[PDB]
């Protein structure tokens, strides 16, 4: 499960909204900003940096 929530690449998708989101990067061990299109994203997609940090704290 941490596989999906923390280890998956960020996914912009095909939709053309600009939703500011956060994703965990396990190579840097840090949550970073990205822009989500709004449709069919994966689980490594957080509304807030703090929520991303909580979800993926310590993950390698």
């Amino acid at each position: 499960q941490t596989e999906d929530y923390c280890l998956a690449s960020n996914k912009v998708g095909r939709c053309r909204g600009s939703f500011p989101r956060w994703y965990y990067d396990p190579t840097e061990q840090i949550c970073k900003s990205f822009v989500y299109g709004g449709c069919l994203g994966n689980k490594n997609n957080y509304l807030r940096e703090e929520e991303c940090i909580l979800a993926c704290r310590g993950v390698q």
Binding site: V12, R14, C15, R16, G17, S18, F19, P20, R21, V35, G37, G38, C39, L40, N45, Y46, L47
Partner: protein
């Protein structure tokens, strides 16, 4: 908008910017009357613990030119009272990607703020016609927004071509607009914004709504837009416009 240029001030007085709470600009929209905006359904779906369908969560900026100058003269700020997503909207196929947004208080028409014309249900925007896409969206896929409103001239693509470029993904509610050559396209942040088409008397009609694309500005991957004429009666029935 990829491969566009800065719009002139006052050039697209129907172009609107929609901001969600704590998140800045999310989607575009078009003004169609003093009370109503047309936008994309997929912008207003509950997600990640945030209620994008909740009208209180949004702010519309009208007469906006530059995102860093939202208090410039002529810029009108409005709350939403109502969001009507099309009932047949499907968030897997992106079919019926259209929404109507009701302003809490009416827009005041000015040199900066004016509605776009709506086409009759029977009207056809012909293949090959040069039309315009506008927005503050990304200048490159996976890139960054534009402070200054962008415009890009694109062309209506034949439905048969469109279907073959994106097999099993194009419905009759959808229209490909762009270039088979790529280079000019809408992009993330442009969704909900209008296609603008100069018609027989010089007046501008809305040809469609920015929806989706496979990346942005790629060869043989034009933008996919929601048609407008098909939804003319739905708009009338729900808004009186």
């Amino acid at each position: 908008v990829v491969g566009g240029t800065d719009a002139d001030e006052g050039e697209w007085p129907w172009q609107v910017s929609l901001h969600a709470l704590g998140q800045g600009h999310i989607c575009g929209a078009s003004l169609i009357s003093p009370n109503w905006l047309v936008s994309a359904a997929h912008c207003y779906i509950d997600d990640r613990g945030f209620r994008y369908s909740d009208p209180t969560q949004w702010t519309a900026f009208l007469g906006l030119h530059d995102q860093s100058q939202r208090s410039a003269p002529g810029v009108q700020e409005r709350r939403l009272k109502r969001i009507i997503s099309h009932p047949f909207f499907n968030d897997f196929t992106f079919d019926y990607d259209i929404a109507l947004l009701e302003l809490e208080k009416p827009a005041e028409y000015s040199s900066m703020v004016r509605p776009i014309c709506l086409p009759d249900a029977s009207h056809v925007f012909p293949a090959g016609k040069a039309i315009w896409v506008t927005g503050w969206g990304h200048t490159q896929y996976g890139g960054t927004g534009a402070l200054i409103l962008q415009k890009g001239e694109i062309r209506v693509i034949q439905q048969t071509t469109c279907e073959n470029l994106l097999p099993q993904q194009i419905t009759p509610r959808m229209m490909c607009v762009g270039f088979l050559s790529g280079g000019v396209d809408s992009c993330q942040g442009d969704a909900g914004g209008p296609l603008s088409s100069v018609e027989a008397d010089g007046r501008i009609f809305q040809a469609g709504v920015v929806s989706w694309g496979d990346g942005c500005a790629q060869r043989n991957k034009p933008g996919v837009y929601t048609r407008l004429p098909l939804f003319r009666d739905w708009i009338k029935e729900n808004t009186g416009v």
